[PDB]
Design a protein around this ligand. Structure first.
Ligand SMILES: [Cl-]
Length: 130
């Protein structure tokens, strides 16, 4: 997979990274939704300093592998292609750059970094099992 969070791809290693940096985070998952056999974990942090500014972040995992890093609430006055490309290396596997999509909400932007293959697998899985 081509996406990491500062070198980490698994929920627990990401949780340890954030905890040791004294960053508060919230964890949500599909364990109750699925009644026991969950496949999704998302970790949420607020006010995280990136090259797109101070942003909120979701770290999205499928089968304990990161597939998506979403930066939220970026100023509409930010140079989006520049800040997205500047932050990219920190969310990219050493082998391969993560993909990214700029999402315009009108009053602000999100940037979603993602592994295209993994994200397609997630979409395929949702359509199959729901
Ligand atoms: Cl939590």
């Amino acid at each position: 997979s081509d996406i990491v969070f500062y070198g980490h791809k698994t929920p627990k290693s990401v949780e340890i990274y954030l905890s040791e940096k004294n960053i508060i985070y919230k964890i949500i998952n599909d364990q109750k939704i699925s009644r026991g056999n969950g496949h999704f974990i998302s970790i949420m942090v607020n006010n995280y300093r990136t090259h797109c500014g101070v942003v909120d972040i979701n770290l999205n995992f499928f089968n304990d592998i990161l597939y998506s890093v979403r930066l939220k609430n970026i100023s509409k006055l930010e140079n989006m292609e520049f800040c997205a490309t500047k932050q990219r290396v920190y969310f990219s596997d050493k082998n391969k750059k993560a993909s990214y999509k700029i999402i315009n909400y009108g009053d602000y932007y999100d940037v979603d970094y993602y592994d295209n293959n993994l994200k397609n697998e997630v979409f395929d899985w949702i359509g199959k099992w729901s």
